[PDB]
Amino acid sequence: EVETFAFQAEIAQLMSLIINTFYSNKEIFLRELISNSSDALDKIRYESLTDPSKLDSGKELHINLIPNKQDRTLTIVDTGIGMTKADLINNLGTIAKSGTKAFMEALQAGADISMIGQFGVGFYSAYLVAEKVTVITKHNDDEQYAWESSAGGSFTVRTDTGEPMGRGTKVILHLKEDQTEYLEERRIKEIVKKHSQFIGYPITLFVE
Numbered sequence: 001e002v003e004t005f006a007f008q009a010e011i012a013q014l015m016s017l018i019i020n021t022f023y024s025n026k027e028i029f030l031r032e033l034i035s036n037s038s039d040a041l042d043k044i045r046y047e048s049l050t051d052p053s054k055l056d057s058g059k060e061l062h063i064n065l066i067p068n069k070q071d072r073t074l075t076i077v078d079t080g081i082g083m084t085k086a087d088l089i090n091n092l093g094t095i096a097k098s099g100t101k102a103f104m105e106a107l108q109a110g111a112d113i114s115m116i117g118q119f120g121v122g123f124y125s126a127y128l129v130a131e132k133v134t135v136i137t138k139h140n141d142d143e144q145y146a147w148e149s150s151a152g153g154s155f156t157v158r159t160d161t162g163e164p165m166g167r168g169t170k171v172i173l174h175l176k177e178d179q180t181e182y183l184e185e186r187r188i189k190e191i192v193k194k195h196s197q198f199i200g201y202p203i204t205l206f207v208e
């Protein structure tokens with residue numbers, strides 16, 4: 001049962017911009033997603049203070065970076081709060097609707113794309129390097145879901161039947177032909193040291 005949705009006009013406009021604008025400093029994508037992870041880990045650590053049993057889905061609060069040369073993917077996995085189907089489909093794209101506004105006038109004479117995260121729409125930066133992005137997520141307690149988009153105006157949501165994941169979010173970047181550099185170990189280690197030095201959770205870089 002694959003459902004297909006339209007992006008809100010504004011999000012679509014943002015995605016085309018991210019995909020068409022000439023901009024050489026693409027590496028910022030990793031800071032945005034690692035930071036989205038950080039927030040998601042914060043959220044669950046906070047809520048589990050008044051409700052110890054929300055950790056029943058997983059005690060470890062961490063972030064994994066997993067490169068795969070053969071499939072040509074970089075996956076950022078966290079065990080944070082996850083999203084429900086209503087996050088994925090409505091709630092995230094309604095909030096994104098106005099961060100996209102502000103961010104988009106700042107771009108017209110002045111701000112630059114590297115500032116995208118200040119407007120809470122950092123996730124879309126993944127399109128600097130990915131031709132296709134797939135988000136797998138599990139929130140206590142809804143089912144686990146797979147969101148997917150190659151931009152172009154539309155996205156899909158289906159329930160997921162891949163490997164179960166406790167609780168958490170996986171972002172899988174299917175990188176474009178010319179961005180395989182972000183599958184390189186020293187390359188990942190260089191970007192993380194430089195832009196993500198201080199996250200409050202262990203980050204493990206998987207090797208191939």
Ligand SMILES: CCNC(=O)c1cc2c(-c3cc(OCCN4CCCC4)c(Cl)cc3Cl)nc(N)nc2s1
Nearest residue numbers: 036037040081082083087092095096120121123169
């Ligand atoms: C309470 C419901 N859970 C979430 O909002 C989550 C959103 C994310 C996100 C996330 C956050 C995102 O936006 C962050 C900015 N916001 C400020 C408040 C809500 C959205 C977007 Cl556009 C896309 C994604 Cl996939 N990433 C990751 N790794 N984990 C979670 S958990």
